[PDB]
Amino acid sequence: GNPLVYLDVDANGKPLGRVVLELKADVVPKTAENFRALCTGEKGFGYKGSTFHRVIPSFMCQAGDFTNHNGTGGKSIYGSRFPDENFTLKHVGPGVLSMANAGPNTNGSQFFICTIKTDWLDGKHVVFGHVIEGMDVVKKIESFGSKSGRTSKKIVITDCGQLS
Numbered sequence: 001g002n003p004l005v006y007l008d009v010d011a012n013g014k015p016l017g018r019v020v021l022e023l024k025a026d027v028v029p030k031t032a033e034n035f036r037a038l039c040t041g042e043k044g045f046g047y048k049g050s051t052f053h054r055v056i057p058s059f060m061c062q063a064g065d066f067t068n069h070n071g072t073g074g075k076s077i078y079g080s081r082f083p084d085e086n087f088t089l090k091h092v093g094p095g096v097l098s099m100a101n102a103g104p105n106t107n108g109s110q111f112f113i114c115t116i117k118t119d120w121l122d123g124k125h126v127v128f129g130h131v132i133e134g135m136d137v138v139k140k141i142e143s144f145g146s147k148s149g150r151t152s153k154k155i156v157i158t159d160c161g162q163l164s
């Protein structure tokens, strides 16, 4: 079945809880596999210890720049960037998990979790999963953002991995 993965998130070193995500390997196998492997750290790099660097209330929580920590870096398990796999899944509401990018065919490691329906990103960002449990944790993260995206606390993925 589709992988179930988790992120354990803290804010200035205080635990906020766990976000559980389903990855749609049945629809975007290569995108799902990248995220899955970055959660386990099995390639020797990934999300553990990195931050949510850009968090905009009523929009989304963005993370996965584990090289530069500011939205300019990250890398995939395939190399620095990989193509847009397809745009089959849509940004249908809060809890959608989608790939950040800098234009067509620039997927790396950065990703976002939507806190509203972000339909204007349909056909532009590759959707690959959704929140199974811990939308209340996502809302806590959202609470530390701002309209600019700057966070008021350091929001850290303290642990991550695969459940099934």
Ligand SMILES: CCOC(=O)[C@H](CCSC)NC(=O)NCc1ccc(N)cc1
Binding pocket: 060, 062, 071, 072, 073, 074, 081, 099, 100, 101, 102, 103, 106, 107, 108, 109, 110, 112
């Ligand atoms: C809500 C998601 O927002 C984004 O993805 C914005 C979009 C700027 S318009 C291209 N981009 C960004 O924050 N960051 C740019 C970026 C750079 C390299 C990779 N591998 C991924 C992303």
Ligand SMILES: [K+]
Binding pocket: none
């Ligand atoms: K806006």
Ligand SMILES: [K+]
Binding pocket: none
């Ligand atoms: K800094």
